[PDB]
Structure 1
């Protein structure tokens, strides 16, 4: 699931039917505590970020970042937050819209009797 997963990521029929599936994949990869799974998940989110930027998918991008942030806050995982903040991935930061040239600030602003039975034996 290294190159075939990437080819799944690059394109499909619609902009769905592989989104939620890979959401489950990264969720179960986060469930197991092996770091390479976390690296695979960060690669997946990087690919999703570039694909959303290059395919006008800001809605999916921001919804996914908010959902994953809430989920990882809910569950007892820290090292995933460690690597994410070491990289920095959050919602769009330019103008809350498609395209602009504003430096990233939204990510920065959002992420700094019976008992007798026993003894009568």
Structure 2
């Protein structure tokens, strides 16, 4: 049980750091059934609630795009 619980944590974070079009959103909306630990209750349910909603959104950071010599170009396109 707990082994697949930490496996669930690992796979969830792995798909999170992965960026896909048909990403874990389909998995999560079907992962409404036990995507999180259940060996001792209490922590199990709250961890399930935390993992269900994947937790927030805010963009920040300069020169973080593909081919940084275009990141300044991306910065260049900010004046018109």
TM-score band, normalised by the shorter chain? 0.3 to 0.5
Q: TM-score, normalised by structure 1?
A: 0.29
Say whether 1:61 aligns with 2:20.
Answer: no
Residues 83, 120 of structure 1: CA spacing in aligned structure 2 closer, same or farther, 3 A cutoff?
closer
5+ residue gaps, structure 1, are 1-57
| TM-score (structure 2 length as normaliser) | 0.39
Q: Distance in 2 between matches of 1:110 and 1:89?
A: 10
Deviations 1:49-108 (A, max 9, x none): xxxxxxxxx212211111011111112224131211221257676875179997995366
Higher relative contact order (CA 8 A, sep 6+): 2
Q: Does the Cα contact within 8 Å between 1:94 and 1:101 map onto a contact in 2?
A: yes
Question: Paired residues, what number?
Answer: 64
Where does 1:1-121 land on structure 2 (aligned, <5 Å)? 58-88=1-31, 97=40, 106=49, 110-111=53-54
Is contact 2:36–2:48 with CA below 8 Å preserved after alignment?
A: yes
Q: Which has the larger radius of gyration?
A: 1
- Quickly say closer, same or farther: Cα 1:62–1:81, change in 2 above 3 A: same
Gapped regions of structure 2 (runs ≥ 5): 55-70
| Higher percent of residues as helix | 1
